[PDB]
């Protein structure tokens, strides 16, 4: 039984307090730091797996490429503008309409 | 087959003194048997350190339940340390609760019997040699075979047989001679002649004669009716220091 | 005749059997497996190569239990059955991994009168007439590969039988060194084995009569070692005290340098008493013990060092069973020997070392010469058992 | 022979297979999504620890990394990101 099976989070545990003890970020690191955390990641990643879905819904393709990554970042204004400064590879540009 | 338990006894003791008084106890009749014979240790002459006294009872009605049969079968002398033994087959409260009643008569304390190599392989030298009712000595030969199992680290070898077809035993015996003693002289010499292996040296376990005996050092099994007189008389030399 | 199998049939065995066979091999050898099982006939997983190469990769990394991904391999990438092919993968990886747990007899090949044949085996050619051979009567499939660290080339033949699938029978494994009279084969004595090795006579002779003779009756495990004991090598004939013939260690070259040369040097040695005083018997030096236990090692092992804890000989063999005839005042006297144990000659020199054996006296047959041979010796001469 | 990569490549696989079975992921995309993950950590992992040692605390609790993703992420999913996770943590603890 490991502690994520616990936290029920698909994203492990330990990696994460190990990841952040060794990035010496402060002196003493906490307990609930490593499993906040990785469920935020895992909150997030599963929204934009879900938004990349969608969009591959809409594809009528059964395989999800970069462009539909950049399709479902730029079409959720919300999550545009969080990732404003990143550029998706082999993502291409939006139609004008 | 028939199992002997074996047993020895610390000084020489009076059995006849009761046999009405060994009954009560018992419940039943218990017969007796007074014997003493010759048992020439060398067929030139003997002298008077052969002088052995037997004694032999049983403890049954029943004939017919063969199975619950037992016998306690005395033979000793008494000018050595040791006086005599004893000898009994079978599983039953009745070869014991006489053991008991001298247990607490006579002061004698029992011991298991101890056989080794010295002493197991000149026991089947007494088995086959018999004798006529005109005291003439001849040979019944056996096909005699050996035990051995060595103790070893990795079990590397565990247990391992010597066979000899007991015509070969008659060429051998022929070609040292006539002897009295066959296991001496054409049997135990020509193994290590040969194989160099010395039988007396080694863990020996058991040796087998065809059909006759059954000797092993924890008990000795034969299938005759009762056991013979030089058989008893070479283990009272052995058990004697 | 289409009575022949495919490498794409899926015979109806046992989820369980399966599952204990794939037990015993180890977690690093299961994912080199998977890897190239799909690259042949694929798999019910839905990705490509480089998808499942990914997840497998990762199971490594979690330090994920063998019994997750046995259980994956056999209820979720292949949940229906396993191939033939993949069984015979299974079979052969479990024979390297563990070549102690199978045992071996050796056959003979006969041409003519009494001349040996040596077989020359083509791997393609050899394959095919045995498949004509065997499917006229039964179903046949069969599997070659080669030993890693040895010259020999095994073949597994299975057999299969309608009673709808098929039902697998026990299979056969026959073992062909290069260049060697001698071929090895499994014990079997059922209907499969007399039809399987009787086929293998027809097939590699092509152009005259063979005929397989048993050299043995006594099976030895560890292919391995049967190879020096019977195969093709320099320790065959030269076993026991004459060890060191085999490898000639002893001899230098002749353009070899001359100083080296133990004719100078000589040879440590101790005099051995002709007059028997073993039977009686003082604190031996240490010395004068170091050198009988040299002797010991001698006729056990061939040299001081030992061609190979100390007591473990080259080949160790189970059984051994010897007779010895001798004729004395015009009539035989026959000793009969067996032995039995782990390792008989190897026990035999620990007995010598406790001084409970004569080594002075002890015969060449039992000091190990001609070794896992057991027959009838008269006038020193040995005779192998008919 | 090689170290192993460490990614969550497993993690994500397997979130996307809870959530259909369908369809698949290509290489590219798996890229994508380990770069995006790393980024986020280290974003927020940054902002703790540069709010940590703002107000002289030696230590990074809940209180400081729920205050650091209040920080990074906008309110819109701020909220249900301060949600689930202190659902977890409490759960956690009851565990």
Same mark, same amino acid.
């Given at each position: 039984?490991?502690?994520?099976?616990?936290?029920?989070?698909?994203?492990?545990?330990?990696?994460?307090?190990?990841?952040?003890?060794?990035?010496?970020?402060?002196?003493?690191?906490?307990?609930?730091?490593?499993?906040?955390?990785?469920?935020?990641?895992?909150?997030?990643?599963?929204?934009?797996?879900?938004?990349?879905?969608?969009?591959?819904?809409?594809?009528?393709?059964?395989?999800?490429?970069?462009?539909?990554?950049?399709?479902?970042?730029?079409?959720?204004?919300?999550?545009?503008?969080?990732?404003?400064?990143?550029?998706?590879?082999?993502?291409?540009?939006?139609?004008?309409? | 087959?028939?199992?002997?338990?074996?047993?020895?006894?610390?000084?020489?003791?009076?059995?006849?003194?009761?046999?009405?008084?060994?009954?009560?106890?018992?419940?039943?009749?218990?017969?007796?048997?007074?014997?003493?014979?010759?048992?020439?240790?060398?067929?030139?002459?003997?002298?008077?350190?052969?002088?052995?006294?037997?004694?032999?009872?049983?403890?049954?009605?029943?004939?017919?339940?063969?199975?619950?049969?037992?016998?306690?079968?005395?033979?000793?002398?008494?000018?050595?340390?040791?006086?005599?033994?004893?000898?009994?087959?079978?599983?039953?409260?009745?070869?014991?609760?006489?053991?008991?009643?001298?247990?607490?008569?006579?002061?004698?304390?029992?011991?298991?019997?101890?056989?080794?190599?010295?002493?197991?392989?000149? %026991?089947?030298?007494?088995?086959?040699?018999?004798? =006529? @009712?005109?005291?003439? !000595?001849? #040979?019944?030969?056996?096909?005699?075979? +050996?035990?051995?199992?060595?103790?070893?680290?990795?079990?590397?070898?565990?247990?391992?047989?010597?066979?000899?077809?007991?015509?070969?035993?008659?060429?051998?015996?022929?070609?040292?001679?006539?002897?009295?003693?066959?296991?001496?002289?054409?049997?135990?010499?020509?193994?290590?002649?040969?194989?160099?292996?010395?039988?007396?040296?080694?863990? %020996?376990?058991?040796?087998?004669?065809?059909?006759? =005996? @059954?000797?092993?050092? !924890?008990? #000795?099994?034969?299938?005759?009716?009762? +056991?013979?007189?030089?058989?008893?008389?070479?283990?009272?030399?052995?058990?004697?220091? | 005749?289409?009575?022949?199998?495919?490498?794409?049939?899926?015979?109806?065995?046992?989820?369980?059997?399966?599952?204990?066979?794939?037990?015993?091999?180890?977690?690093?050898?299961?994912?080199?497996?998977?890897?190239?099982?799909?690259?042949?006939?694929?798999?019910?997983?839905?990705?490509?190569?480089?998808?499942?190469?990914?997840?497998?990769?990762?199971?490594?990394?979690?330090?994920?239990?063998?019994?997750?991904?046995?259980?994956?391999?056999?209820?979720?990438?292949?949940?229906?059955?396993?191939?033939?092919?993949?069984?015979?993968?299974?079979?052969?990886?479990?024979?390297?991994?563990?070549?102690?747990?199978?045992?071996?007899?050796?056959?003979?090949?006969?041409?003519?009168?009494?001349?040996?044949?040596?077989?020359?085996?083509?791997?393609?050619?050899?394959?095919?007439?045995?498949?004509?051979?065997?499917?006229?009567?039964?179903?046949?499939?069969?599997?070659?590969?080669?030993?890693?660290?040895?010259?020999?080339?095994?073949?597994?033949?299975?057999?299969?039988?309608?009673?709808?699938?098929?039902?697998?029978?026990?299979?056969?494994?026959?073992?062909?060194?290069?260049?060697?009279?001698?071929?090895?084969?499994?014990?079997?004595?059922?209907?499969?084995?007399?039809?399987?090795?009787?086929?293998?006579?027809?097939?590699?002779?092509?152009?005259?009569?063979?005929?397989?003779?048993?050299?043995?009756?006594?099976?030895?495990?560890?292919?391995?070692?049967?190879?020096?004991?019977?195969?093709?090598?320099?320790?065959?004939?030269?076993?026991?005290?004459?060890?060191?013939?085999?490898?000639?260690?002893?001899?230098?070259?002749?353009?070899?340098?001359?100083?080296?040369?133990?004719?100078?040097?000589?040879?440590?040695?101790?005099?051995?008493?002709?007059?028997?005083?073993?039977?009686?018997?003082?604190?031996?030096?240490?010395?004068?013990?170091?050198?009988?236990?040299?002797?010991?090692?001698?006729?056990?092992?061939?040299?001081?060092?030992?061609?190979?804890?100390?007591?473990?000989?080259?080949?160790?063999?189970?059984?051994?069973?010897?007779?010895?005839?001798?004729?004395?005042?015009?009539?035989?006297?026959?000793?009969?020997?067996?032995?039995?144990?782990?390792?008989?000659?190897?026990?035999?020199?620990?007995?010598?070392?406790?001084?409970?054996?004569?080594?002075?006296?002890?015969?060449?047959?039992?000091?190990?010469?001609?070794?896992?041979?057991?027959?009838?010796?008269?006038?020193?001469?040995?005779?192998?058992?008919? | 022979?090689?170290?192993?990569?460490?990614?969550?490549?497993?993690?994500?696989?397997?979130?996307?297979?809870?959530?259909?079975?369908?369809?698949?992921?290509?290489?590219?995309?798996?890229?994508?999504?380990?770069?995006?993950?790393?980024?986020?950590?280290?974003?927020?992992?940054?902002?703790?620890?540069?709010?940590?040692?703002?107000?002289?605390?030696?230590?990074?609790?809940?209180?400081?990394?729920?205050?650091?993703?209040?920080?990074?992420?906008?309110?819109?999913?701020?909220?249900?990101?301060?949600?689930?996770?202190?659902?977890?943590?409490?759960?956690?603890?009851?565990?």
């Amino acid at each position: 039984q490991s502690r994520s099976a616990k936290a029920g989070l698909t994203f492990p545990v330990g990696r994460v307090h190990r990841l952040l003890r060794r990035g010496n970020y402060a002196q003493r690191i906490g307990s609930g730091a490593p499993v906040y955390l990785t469920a935020v990641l895992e909150y997030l990643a599963a929204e934009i797996l879900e938004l990349a879905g969608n969009a591959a819904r809409d594809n009528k393709k059964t395989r999800i490429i970069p462009r539909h990554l950049q399709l479902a970042i730029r079409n959720d204004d919300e999550l545009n503008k969080l990732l404003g400064n990143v550029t998706i590879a082999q993502g291409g540009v939006l139609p004008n309409i | 087959p028939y199992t002997w338990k074996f047993l020895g006894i610390s000084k020489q003791l009076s059995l006849e003194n009761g046999i009405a008084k060994l009954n009560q106890l018992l419940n039943l009749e218990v017969d007796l048997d007074i014997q003493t014979i010759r048992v020439p240790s060398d067929p030139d002459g003997g002298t008077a350190a052969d002088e052995y006294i037997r004694y032999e009872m049983r403890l049954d009605i029943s004939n017919l339940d063969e199975g619950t049969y037992s016998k306690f079968i005395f033979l000793g002398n008494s000018k050595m340390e040791v006086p005599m033994f004893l000898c009994y087959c079978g599983t039953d409260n009745r070869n014991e609760v006489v053991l008991q009643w001298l247990k607490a008569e006579y002061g004698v304390i029992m011991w298991p019997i101890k056989f080794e190599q010295k002493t197991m392989i000149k %026991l089947a030298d007494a088995s086959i040699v018999h004798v =006529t @009712k005109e005291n003439i !000595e001849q #040979i019944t030969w056996f096909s005699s075979k +050996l035990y051995f199992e060595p103790e070893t680290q990795d079990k590397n070898l565990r247990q391992f047989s010597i066979e000899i077809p007991r015509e070969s035993c008659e060429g051998l015996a022929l070609g040292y001679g006539n002897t009295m003693h066959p296991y001496n002289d054409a049997i135990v010499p020509y193994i290590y002649n040969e194989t160099g292996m010395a039988v007396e040296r080694l863990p %020996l376990t058991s040796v087998i004669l065809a059909g006759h =005996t @059954k000797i092993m050092r !924890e008990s #000795i099994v034969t299938s005759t009716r009762s +056991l013979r007189n030089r058989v008893l008389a070479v283990v009272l030399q052995s058990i004697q220091f | 005749n289409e009575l022949r199998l495919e490498d794409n049939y899926v015979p109806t065995s046992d989820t369980l059997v399966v599952f204990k066979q794939l037990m015993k091999l180890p977690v690093t050898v299961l994912y080199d497996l998977t890897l190239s099982w799909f690259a042949k006939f694929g798999g019910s997983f839905d990705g490509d190569i480089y998808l499942l190469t990914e997840t497998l990769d990762l199971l490594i990394e979690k330090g994920v239990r063998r019994n997750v991904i046995v259980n994956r391999i056999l209820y979720v990438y292949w949940p229906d059955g396993l191939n033939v092919f993949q069984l015979a993968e299974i079979d052969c990886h479990l024979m390297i991994s563990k070549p102690e747990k199978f045992k071996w007899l050796p056959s003979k090949a006969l041409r003519g009168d009494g001349k040996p044949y040596v077989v020359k085996l083509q791997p393609a050619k050899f394959i095919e007439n045995l498949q004509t051979d065997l499917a006229k009567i039964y179903h046949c499939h069969v599997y070659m590969f080669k030993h890693p660290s040895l010259p020999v080339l095994i073949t597994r033949i299975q057999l299969f039988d309608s009673n709808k699938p098929l039902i697998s029978r026990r299979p056969y494994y026959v073992a062909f060194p290069l260049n060697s009279p001698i071929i090895f084969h499994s014990v079997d004595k059922d209907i499969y084995a007399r039809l399987v090795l009787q086929s293998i006579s027809r097939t590699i002779s092509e152009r005259e009569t063979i005929i397989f003779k048993p050299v043995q009756k006594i099976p030895v495990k560890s292919i391995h070692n049967i190879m020096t004991l019977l195969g093709p090598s320099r320790f065959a004939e030269s076993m026991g005290p004459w060890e060191c013939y085999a490898s000639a260690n002893f001899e230098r070259s002749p353009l070899h340098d001359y100083k080296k040369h133990q004719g100078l040097t000589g040879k440590k040695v101790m005099v051995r008493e002709f007059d028997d005083s073993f039977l009686n018997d003082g604190k031996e030096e240490p010395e004068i013990r170091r050198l009988r236990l040299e002797k010991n090692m001698i006729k056990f092992k061939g040299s001081a060092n030992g061609v190979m804890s100390r007591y473990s000989s080259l080949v160790p063999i189970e059984k051994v069973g010897f007779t010895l005839k001798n004729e004395i005042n015009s009539r035989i006297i026959t000793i009969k020997l067996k032995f039995n144990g782990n390792d008989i000659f190897g026990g035999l020199h620990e007995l010598c070392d406790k001084n409970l054996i004569n080594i002075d006296k002890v015969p060449g047959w039992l000091a190990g010469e001609n070794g896992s041979f057991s027959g009838t010796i008269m006038n020193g001469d040995f005779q192998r058992e008919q | 022979s090689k170290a192993r990569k460490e990614t969550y490549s497993s993690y994500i696989y397997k979130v996307l297979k809870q959530t259909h079975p369908d369809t698949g992921i290509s290489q590219k995309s798996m890229s994508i999504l380990n770069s995006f993950v790393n980024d986020i950590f280290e974003r927020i992992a940054t902002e703790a620890s540069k709010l940590a040692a703002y107000n002289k605390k030696s230590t990074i609790s809940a209180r400081e990394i729920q205050t650091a993703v209040r920080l990074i992420l906008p309110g819109e999913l701020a909220k249900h990101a301060v949600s689930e996770g202190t659902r977890a943590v409490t759960k956690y603890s009851s565990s």
